[PDB]
Amino acid sequence: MANRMILNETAWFGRGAVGALTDEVKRRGYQKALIVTDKTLVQCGVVAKVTDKMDAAGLAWAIYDGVVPNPTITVVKEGLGVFQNSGADYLIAIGGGSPQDTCKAIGIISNNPEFADVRSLEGLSPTNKPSVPILAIPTTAGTAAEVTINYVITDEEKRRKFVCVDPHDIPQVAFIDADMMDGMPPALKAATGVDALTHAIEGYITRGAWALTDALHIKAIEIIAGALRGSVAGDKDAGEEMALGQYVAGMGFSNVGVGLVHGMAHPLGAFYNTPHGVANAILLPHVMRYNADFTGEKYRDIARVMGVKVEGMGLEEARNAAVEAVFALNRDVGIPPHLRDVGVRKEDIPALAQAALDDVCTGGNPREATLEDIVELYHTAWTSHHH
Amino acid sequence: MANRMILNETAWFGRGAVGALTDEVKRRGYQKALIVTDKTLVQCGVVAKVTDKMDAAGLAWAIYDGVVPNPTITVVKEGLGVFQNSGADYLIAIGGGSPQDTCKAIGIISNNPEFADVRSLEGLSPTNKPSVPILAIPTTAGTAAEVTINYVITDEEKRRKFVCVDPHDIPQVAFIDADMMDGMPPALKAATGVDALTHAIEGYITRGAWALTDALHIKAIEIIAGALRGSVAGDKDAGEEMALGQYVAGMGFSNVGVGLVHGMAHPLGAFYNTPHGVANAILLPHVMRYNADFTGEKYRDIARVMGVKVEGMGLEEARNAAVEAVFALNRDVGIPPHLRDVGVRKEDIPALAQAALDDVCTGGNPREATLEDIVELYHTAWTSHHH
């Protein structure tokens, strides 16, 4: 059981980090970018922040702005057409998950043309050539698509999504620039922030957790717990910290499994289209409580970096302190306290529990959960038991 | 001031991790390896551990075993000749710093032939093509050459070393396998271990330190402090932990500066050819004491991961506890307590101090040191003041 880590070979961090793109492109000798993005980011002038710098530095670019939410086989083929017809030799992905995923597909098919039908990339793609180089510029503080080897494409003909898993698709450079993100409403910054915290905590305690993912996850938890209140209140430095925290959490959670929070949040998506972030946030502290005795010393670390002094406490008191710290953050940033507050129905719990039990990613949970354990966990998260 | 991180895109960790090489090569589609190594590793059967696996998996390889300590322009040209004449399309670097550095030079010149004279690579190499892909297998627990963008070549004609700095030279995969290292004497495991601890502590507190290098450095300190006693005593699991700790320390310290320990150890190399590791180890706690008031909360973290309970202490007591923990580890693993125990002469301190002051890397030290500060620090490290 050797451990593998896959990361972006190069990453730039800070407000104004996108400024590093022109010097990277020059040193890399690339002739011409295809910018892959959507109409919205062009219309709002976000793409122009990049093209203005490239024009000033004398760097050639073309654009494909046809990306839509749930990118399709058509969008991939369309983008690959513009790549081929524009004299481009590298990709700049400007946007959230959809542009990032569309770039991976375009870049893979360009160097692996036997996959031109796109649907043949599903599962562990048998590619033998790296993607065309991708320079990734995420514009949402909620995406880490640019540090994962996964991408999701919609097959319109067959009426389904398909997941592609391929180390060859990893972007060569990530630019993590809070200036390119700015402008979520407080409520979504809250859900997004605790969504990242959930991935970092689940990754910290997943069965396969090891030294390198532990190193990154505990830093992400420290950053997110330190910054999320300030970020929700619109603090500029807090926003920059949250961009870093989301990426660092991304580095860890892209390389190890998850557990029952993901397992239990995913069916709530399938049933009520509850925001993945809000469902995750509500469940997190209840699942942390469930898992506590199977986490060794790790909740001491979580308690410490969330600002609680626990070195004088016994291990179980320290574990209780970590759980209470997460309840406190959820309250402070306006997460609904219970699943019924976001429209979950008591009568669906047996069905939801079965879905969570059969979810592949539930196997990463450090404590074994039976159907009945998961039923009881939904109920504890569903309503207050103060009456 | 955006921060850059450069890392190996892929790394494999654990005893038997070199087993992952054959599946990596197959998925990457590469036709044929040039193995770059020295005669010693061939003679002792270390290279055969790799070629035996490649032969069983049906993977083609050639060998260049002409690497010597302080690799020369001649060794680079010789290796490039074998690369060209063997039908190789990728590199496997088997060995310590010398084979790793020779590979970077060969791989860069192969894809950047305008640098065929080798000496034209000195400084920030103006390469526009990535190196031929390098799969790095370090065989010494003391090297992190495979995660740095630096390499050093000896110019025999001009009677000098030259340093090449080039993001294009970064290996694509590192295999960190304690089985490929096994067999240092205790005394050198001790010097090597505290050498890694020194890089991690200096990197943790250097002026340019930031969230991602902090995340990796504090994990390396935890791993090394936890494992070094067991490793020196020949514990097998401790040896595996030390291989991981050295690499993780490598990830951090390759991306940020150092300080006065490096600044003061380097002239001791130039004057007495004192092992870089032993000089670093002796100086570390004295420099930590000097720096303490310019390190914020960080020595609390060092104290904690080295096994000291300091949450009840004031910050300055916690800082004293970190320093005492490092003195304790040095004693426990047999580091000489004072510089005069390794032949440093009192009369050389003014000259050594001047060299340290003018060393470029001394600028990373979080506390300003004048000539007189550095003179006094050498004296405090030079002899016991208990008599």
How does DSSP assign A232-284, residue by residue? HTT-HHHHHHHHHHHHHHHHHHTTS---HHHHHHHHHHHHH---HHHHHHHHH
**Which residues, other chains included, contact A222 with Cβ-Cβ below 8 Å and sequence gap of 6+?**
A305
Sheet containing B123-124: give its strands across.
B123-124, B160-165, B150-155
Cβ distance B128 to A29 less than 8 Å, yes or no, reads yes
B280 vs A290: CA distance, rounded Å: 46
Q: Pairing relation of β-strands A90-95 and A32-36?
A: parallel
- Which of B7, B25, B129, B237 to mutate against chain A (most A CBs within 10 Å)? B7
Instruction: Collect all residues of chain A within an 8 Å Cβ-Cβ radius of residue B309.
Output: 311
* Full set of structural domains in chain B with CATH: 10-180 (3.40.50.1970), 186-382 (1.20.1090.10)
How far apart are alpha carbons B163 and B124 in whole angstroms?
9
How near does any CA of chain A get to the CA of B27, in Å?
6
Which residues of A lie inside 8 Å of B (Cβ-Cβ)?
1-14, 16-17, 19-20, 27-29, 128-129, 167, 170, 177, 210-212, 214-216, 218-219, 223, 244, 248, 309-312
What element of type H or E holds B84? Answer: helix B73-85
> Smallest CA–CA separation between B240 and chain A, in Å?
11
Report chain B's terminal Cα–Cα distance, integer Å.
49
Both tokens assigned to A275: 């925001």
The answer to whether B10 contacts A5, with C-beta atoms less than 8 Å apart, is yes
- Crossing angle of helices A186-205 and A211-232, in 10° steps, is 160
CA distance B24 to B273: 41
Question: Looking at the DSSP assignment, which residues form a beta bridge with residue B14?
Answer: none
Residues of each annotated binding site of B for NAD(+) = 38, 70, 97-98, 139-143, 150, 161, 180-184
Q: Which two tokens stand for residue A344?
A: 């979950």
Q: Is A37 left (phi over 0), alpha (psi -120 to 50) or beta?
A: beta
Minimum distance, in Å, between the CA of residue A78 and any CA atom of chain B = 27
How far from A349 is each of A273, A279, A369, CA to CA, in Å?
15, 14, 15
Q: How many angstroms separate the CA atoms of A266 and A256, rounded?
A: 18
Strands A123-124 and A90-95: what pairing?
Answer: unpaired
Q: Chain A residue with minimal CA distance to B126?
A: A27
Inter-chain contact A211–B27, Cβ cutoff 8 Å?
A: no
Q: A10 and B6 in contact by Cβ < 8 A?
A: yes
- Whether A309 and B309 lie within 8 Å, measured CB to CB: no
DSSP string, A83-131: HHHTT--EEEEEESHHHHHHHHHHHHHHH-GGGTTSGGGSEE----S--
Tokens 């380097």 -> residue: B266
Closest-CA residue in chain B for A17? B2
- Could you tell me the resolution of this structure in angstroms? 1.7
Cα–chain center distance at B188: 14
Q: Which of B12, B28, B214 sits opposite A4 (nearest CB)?
A: B12
Nearest alpha carbon to residue B132 among B114, B150, B151, B106: B106
B9 and A210 within 8 Å at the Cβ level: the answer is: no
Among candidate residues B4, B1, B8, the one with its CA nearest the CA of residue B250: B8
Mutation choice for A interface testing from B1, B13, B108, B214 by most A CBs within 10 A? B13
Q: From the list A8, A210, A248, which residue is nearest B211 (CB)?
A: A248
Residue A63: phi, psi to the nearest 5? -135, 140
Q: Which residues of A touch B312 (CB under 8 A)?
A: 311-312
Note whether B2 contacts A14, CB cutoff 8 Å: yes
Of A287, A253, A247, give the one whose Cα is nearest residue A268: A287
Backbone region of residue A16 per phi and psi (left: phi > 0; alpha: psi in -120 to 50; beta: other values): left
Do A167 and B5 lie within an 8 Å CB cutoff?
Answer: no
In which residue are the tokens 């601890």 written? B197
Nearest to B204 by CA among B148, B146, B256: B256
Pairing state of beta strands A60-64 and B10-13? unpaired
CA dist., res. A78 & res. A75, Å (int) = 5
Nearest CA in chain A to B23: A128
What span, in angstroms and rounded, lies between the C-alpha atoms of A248 and A220? 6
- Closest chain A CA to residue B8: A9
> How many Cβ pairs closer than 8 A exist between chain A and B?
105
The rounded distance, in Å, linking the Cα atoms of A58 and A117 is 35
Packed helices A260-272 and A371-382: angle between N→C axes, nearest 10 degrees: 70
CB B380 within 8 A of CB B323: no
Beta carbons of B219 and A214 less than 8 Å apart: yes
Residue in B9, B14, B212 closest to A248 by CB: B212
Could you give the 3-state DSSP secondary structure of residue B91? strand
Backbone angles phi, psi at A25, to 5 degrees: -65, -45
Hey, what are B263's tokens? 């600044």
Phi, psi of A212 (to 5 degrees): -75, -45
Find chain A residues with C-beta within 8 A of B11's C-beta: 4-5
CB A183 within 8 A of CB A139: no
Contact by Cβ (8 Å): B156, B72: yes
CB B198 within 8 A of CB B281: yes
Q: How many CB atoms lie within 10 A of CB A297?
A: 9
3-state DSSP of A11-43 = EEECCCHHHHHHHHHHHHCCCEEEEECEHHHHH
Q: Which residues of B touch A (CB under 8 A)?
A: 1-14, 16-17, 19-20, 27-29, 128-129, 167, 170, 177, 210-212, 214-216, 218-219, 223, 244, 248, 309-312
The verdict on a CB contact (< 8 Å) between B248 and A10 is: no
The first and second tokens of residue B54, run together, are 């490649």
Report the distance separating Cα A286 and Cα A269, nearest Å. 18
> What tokens were used for A347?
């009568």
Distance, CA of A363 to CA of A208 (rounded, Å): 10
Spatial CA neighbour of B79 closest among B118, B44, B135, B48? B118
Q: How far apart are CA A60 and CA A118, in angstroms?
A: 28
Distance CA B236, CA A286 (A): 39
Chain centroid to CA A369: 25
Region for A185 from its dihedrals, namely left if φ exceeds 0, alpha if ψ lies in -120 to 50, beta otherwise: beta
Please enumerate in sequence order all residues whose Cβ is within 8 A of that of A159, keeping only pairs 6 or more positions apart, or say none: none
Complete DSSP assignment for A268-335? HHHHH---HHHHHHHHHHHHHHHHGGGSTTHHHHHHHHTT---TTS-HHHHHHHHHHHHHHHHHHTT-
Bridging pattern class, strands A32-36 and A60-64: parallel
Q: Give yes or no for a contact between A176 and A17, defined as CB atoms under 8 angstroms apart.
A: yes
Please tell me chain B's helix, strand, coil percentages from 3-state DSSP, rounded to the nearest 5.
60, 15, 30
